[PDB]
Amino acid sequence: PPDLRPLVPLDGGRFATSDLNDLYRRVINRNNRLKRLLDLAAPDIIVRNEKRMLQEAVDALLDNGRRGRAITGSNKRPLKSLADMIKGKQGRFRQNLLGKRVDYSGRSVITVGPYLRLHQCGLPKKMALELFKPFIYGKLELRGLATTIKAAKKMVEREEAVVWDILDEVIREHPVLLNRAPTLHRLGIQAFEPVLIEGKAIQLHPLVCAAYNADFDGDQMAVHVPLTLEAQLEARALMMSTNNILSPANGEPIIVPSQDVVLGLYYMTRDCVNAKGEGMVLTGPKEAERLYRSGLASLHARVKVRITEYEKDANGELVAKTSLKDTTVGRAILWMIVPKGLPYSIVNQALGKKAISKMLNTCYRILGLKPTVIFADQIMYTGFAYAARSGASVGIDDMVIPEKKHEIISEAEAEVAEIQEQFQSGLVTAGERYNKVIDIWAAANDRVSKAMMDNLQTETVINRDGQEEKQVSFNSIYMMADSGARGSAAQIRQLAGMRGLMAKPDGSIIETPITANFREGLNVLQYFISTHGARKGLADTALKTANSGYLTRRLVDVAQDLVVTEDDCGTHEGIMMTPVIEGGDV
């Protein structure tokens, strides 16, 4: 039909060229020439050539490049035949049927909203005004501010005061679907309650970022507006952020503090052996908060406070127990946001990432879902606030280099020089000499890392009653490493110890390791050596995406039609599961 192969108007009298129209014109011309040749009783050669050329034209129309060279148009390129526009990634099946562009949708960059709740997101006023235009029109017509659709359009274009109130009314409980561009798994699109904000960037809850695999480095997100009541109810009940708390892949939780909440809770829940207002007795957590805010006590002061903890009996009733507990001011303050059903043992320790995750798991197991959500929101708020209050910072003096690094390096160099002398003497051949050199350098790196960790973990010494005492260090780098916020043993080792051995692009280990810290200066040779591994990793990451996407598409296709359609087969068959062991490990 002509409308499926339209002639798109252009500037002036020009018209857009369509490959199908050219193919049809060529076929028609060939057919007409063949008809006029047959009517004129042309010789056999001419009619045979005309028939062959008509067959070739029909073949090109049906499938251009299937046989021979594809017919090219005015653009020096093969034309798009009927088969070319139905198959492939750009065909109708994969471009306009399985996926398609939708209305009531927008796209914008994402910033961080710390004040938002787990079920809320920040939507700019302009985006919400554009997306919810028909709802605003309907509400304006119902309330009588406008009499026709044109009047409502003019009023929303002029952005009158009543328009903002209408927009606030229509988005009270209307969920919006936020989705990131790579939708790897189910949690890539989630429903949130919109909150009107200024600015031009969508505000996203931090706790869901790990679910979205999204960072605030320039990432963008798309928003969709459900229309019918059924879609809104599915968004509220199935795709809401609060409903998605466990990963469908393995059942692990997906809402965990990542960077600043963990650091804040770790700093707040810590003890100093000699701090301000140590050893005093407090009536409760409220007194501890009052003392900390008034400046009369420190957040790490070891005190005794009266804690009332509620526990669930067999019948499920909450029974209170009040007792004096030896704790810190920060732990007592944090106890305020803990719900009643939880015990005090969760907060009476240095709260790292694992500790916070375990406390959230216990809260979910004991109480339920809504108390868990409220607890998570309160945890995020408290962590952010006390991380801001702490004022932790990283400086060039925080990466302490051990004084024994030079001695260890010199000993390793002496050992490898002795090995080289032995090789020159001829007692040891190249392969075993290389192996011994690698082993010596690995041992030296391990010794340097151990010495640096020993120096860093307990560097701080505190004078208690005139006596020196060793305590866990308050170094910012060490605090970040220990709390689990960011960084690991390997990265801290690279920062404060030697970088260790490096590998060639083929995989062979280089004899001379990088004995320079990141705090110190890496010379040209060491940087060039590290660039091999850096480029190898970056190239692997760049090339992995296409293979991963193809595999995911194939798996989705092969398992697209499998759904649960029954309750019980009654089958007595099954598979026998045993622990997996291969000669040393379970």
């Binding site: 939708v102 031009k200 060039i396 960011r486 010379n523």
Partner: protein, 1325 residues
Amino acid sequence: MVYSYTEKKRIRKDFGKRPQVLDVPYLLSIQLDSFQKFIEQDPEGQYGLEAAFRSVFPIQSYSGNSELQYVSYRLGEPVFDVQECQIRGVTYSAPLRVKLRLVIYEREAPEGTVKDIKEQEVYMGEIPLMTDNGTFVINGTERVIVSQLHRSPGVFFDSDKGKTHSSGKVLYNARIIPYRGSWLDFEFDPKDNLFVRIDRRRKLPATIILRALNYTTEQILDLFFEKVIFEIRDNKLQMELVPERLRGETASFDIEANGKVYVEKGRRITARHIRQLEKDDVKLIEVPVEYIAGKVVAKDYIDESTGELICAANMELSLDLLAKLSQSGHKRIETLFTNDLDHGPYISETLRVDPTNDRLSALVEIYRMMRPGEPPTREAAESLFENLFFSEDRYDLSAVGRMKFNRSLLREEIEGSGILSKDDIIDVMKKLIDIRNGKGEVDDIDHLGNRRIRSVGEMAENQFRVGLVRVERAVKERLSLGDLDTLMPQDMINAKPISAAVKEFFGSSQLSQFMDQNNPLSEITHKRRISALGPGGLTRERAGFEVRDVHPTHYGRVCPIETPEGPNIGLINSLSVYAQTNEYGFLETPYRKVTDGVVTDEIHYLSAIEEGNYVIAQANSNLDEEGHFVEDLVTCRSKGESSLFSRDQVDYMDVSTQQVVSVGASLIPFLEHDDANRALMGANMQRQAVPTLRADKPLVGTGMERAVAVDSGVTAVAKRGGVVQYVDASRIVIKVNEDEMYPGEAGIDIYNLTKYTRSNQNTCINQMPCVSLGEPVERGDVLADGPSTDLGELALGQNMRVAFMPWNGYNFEDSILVSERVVQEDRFTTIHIQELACVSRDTKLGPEEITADIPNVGEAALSKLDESGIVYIGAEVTGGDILVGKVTPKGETSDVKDSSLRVPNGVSGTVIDVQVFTRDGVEKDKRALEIEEMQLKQAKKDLSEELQILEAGLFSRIRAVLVAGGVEAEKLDKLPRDRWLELGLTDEEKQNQLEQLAEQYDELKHEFEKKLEAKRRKITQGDDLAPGVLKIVKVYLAVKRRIQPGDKMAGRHGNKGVISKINPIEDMPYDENGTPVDIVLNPLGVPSRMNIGQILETHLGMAAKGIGDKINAMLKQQQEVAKLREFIQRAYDLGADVRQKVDLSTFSDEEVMRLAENLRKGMPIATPVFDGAKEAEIKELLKLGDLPTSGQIRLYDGRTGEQFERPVTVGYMYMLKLNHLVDDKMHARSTGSYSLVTQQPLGGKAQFGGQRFGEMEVWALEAYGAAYTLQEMLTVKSDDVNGRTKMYKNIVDGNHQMEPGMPESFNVLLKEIRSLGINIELEDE
């Protein structure tokens, strides 16, 4: 040392310790020098257009007793200047006129001489000319042709790593790759058979190509094998023995000679027995007949008595065969020395498998392999074989190809014929066989010594040669059949193919691309780029892993960290700072020669191949002022590996510490403290920073900013020294010194700065003067600052007071907290210029007129339009406003439809420029006349300034002449100067001198009038456009984009983020002095992403700002210049044995005051890429000011006023604003336009469109229940038109219910399938 005038204004403090021995070369030379090898006249050719002309010409006429020859070529002067071509949109190009000579010889005489010669000069198209900045001007746009990293022509020996055979056996192959011709391949079969392939076709036995070379079987065995002679004498079966031939083989019989049993049967021959054999020098060893049966005869043996051959060449011997040959009367036989490992019988097996037996059979087989359809013919096969590899026109191994071919085969000569030869193929086969045996090793494909760089000149020459052969075919066709009596050389050729080919190459190519204009660094990086893609190169999808790796040969030639991140990683690289190309195109790097343990200052440029032989010491090698390394063991690199070496074994040393990084990577301070991935991210992100309206120098730099700014053409560099005669915001006039004045010259240089010109990335290009009136200048001194430049130094971002601390989760992952003071000061505000074009064409019904009268528009809309129908300059137009009024004739069936250009929805700005291009023959409107008038006014102003200075000089001369005789100087000033000319003196030589001066003045006036007339003619010349279009009107809109949440900012150390909140000033943390911080950054990014360089830069910037604050405080107290001199000298003298020495004693008091005024905002510090400041130096600089050495101060919370419990790292960091603006990234649509075929919402933000709900989102919805949501996304919101209407009506009516309906995409698919012979339908049963 001494400092230039522009450098003395603000001297950057340099912390570099290692003295520099070689200055940084010109960055764009690689782009320029190559073009200098393409258009320059070459007396011996081998380069440029001369090489192509000599390769094509002379041209025969199929033995037509006539030809045409090429004499010389000349490039004419371009019609328009570079600025003129940019303004008018034409291509900056120059004509090429070639001298041709058609010679016709006498007929009927094969040896007859010339009967006629016709010489002429013919124009053969216009070729583009590269500007002074290494860029081309094509269609008014600046394009850059990046260099291509490809595989050098020659022979390469490789082998699969035991993969295809699936048995661990390596199949060696050798590939001959010509510049032009057919690729040749030799491969080893798993059964140890040599096969030959041409153009990757079906394999054939290798001996076929030898037979086709007129080689007999005996000759082949002689060439590829060693002969062992067996001679029967006195019934003992003796043979000539070479001891080495019996190494590693078990003795089947007893080896006894001269009565001594050397070896007995059953025991393998040992090396000691071989040594004893050569001690006794035995040549005849008794051999039993059983040993013969395992030998292959070498040459044919034919019985003389019977006349028939007993045995041919190359087959296994047998007992009957040896008996027959023994009884035939032959006493001598020759066999092939075949060993199990040293000398395999590959050639013999290949001959056995070879079906051909003669040269003609081999030629027939080759022809039937190449062209199976055509039956073989003797002449056809001969011609095909000759044209395959032995034809100059068809096959051409380049000079570099021949050099590599000879080098790989260990040939002393490096020159030879382009075509192949029998000796070359024989040597290649022998080397491949030796490699298979074990001698030698395969080549490295990714080795930088086997990879060539093709620049603009080489590709341009290749395209010109292609066009030359294209026109030569037609020239031959026309000349052979036409009449030779009246054949002018001009009409025989056609410039159309040459022009089309050159335009196709320069305009539409994979390597000729739009030049990035985000910043000068972007242009520098783009010009110095090497891409492995393009024609005759790798592809993005099929690149692989090995190509993208960092080869050890990349040291000093290719930057390891500067490369795009994404699909094209490792395929696009940046040239190193000191890297340069050889004569053959291979990359080479400088080194300093070490002789007798001292490091000399002589510089040798070593290539990748030749640098492996020597031992190159590391750049970071400590010297003792005597050129001797202090350490006994120096870490050097000998053969692609780093190891310790004795101090006397070194041969070369690195010229500089920046030799390993590129220009972009060398601009990052403290790069050695940053991770390689983070350094790569920072280097990539640096060239994406949009310029700001105010340029701010980097407080912490590397000292390479000056070179980058000067080398790029953004800034205005004085051509000659002098004084600033006239300064202005738009132009500068410099009165040059008399030393540099040319004879008969006015003596003024005029620089016209570009003011608010749209760039290729819709950014603002603005030049601001940096000199004052009367200020002396010198050659090479910057007169105006281009975009992102500050006093001749590159300035990408701004210095922000940053504090590293978490702040209420507003910098949670990567977010950035920005104070309101940054917004108020307009520091990060950018200017974006967008061009909108409206063209009036000539339709079939009628032309399109651009008039101010438009139907169905109100008077308010036409208020902004002028009488000519074009928007006024300076008018502020919002979205939907009308800019240019145009009417298009309606159908035949008012009669005019509105096709006026309108501002796109959501786009605002101020009209700053309107450009009208009118085709010749079309009457110009008022706006075009006004533009031409203003251009003529500017040209007349310049010419009038020149005429005024020249006339003043001439009038001074005439006054001096007249005063000598007249002596009326007291009254001469009373009358005006013109009346001096009409005054006459008494009759002597003075009157003649006055007449000569008057006629010179008249001639000067006439010449200036002629120049003005020529400029007016050039200005008023009609513009050339595409056929069918009459007029073009372009309107430029300028928008000031301010910073806001969602905008993407970054640093130089790979740290990036988006603004999360614009907090009020009072909420920012403040120090004891109450100064708030500007930016708050999350410390959590530092540990995981290992970039301590940003922390060190923060500390150094804090120290620099402390020094600047001290200088400002001393300036505000009106202190004497002595205190300022002492303090600045103390600041500059800080450090440990730094190479930079600044003596303020030589500086004048005014110069010291100017330097202090420049430094009052902070002292710039130069930190080299690998020779930067140490921690101790930073602490000393911090102690110089009143700042703590720890780098952390005490901060108070703005909101609560409570001191933070721990010190926080505060300082000054250079932050950049990337070209990712949130307001340019928004989009929102409820309902809009729909597509035609699919009836789906459109795509993109320029046209109102919706987001794409792709396959992954559909799968995610299917993972949930989401049935109704998916149905409404697939039908109601996208395709179902009735569903769309009903849903909209229901929502307006307050009912949230939908009707699914039938999507139109499925109907379109059904019709598409039905268009074929396949019937598809829906069944209602």
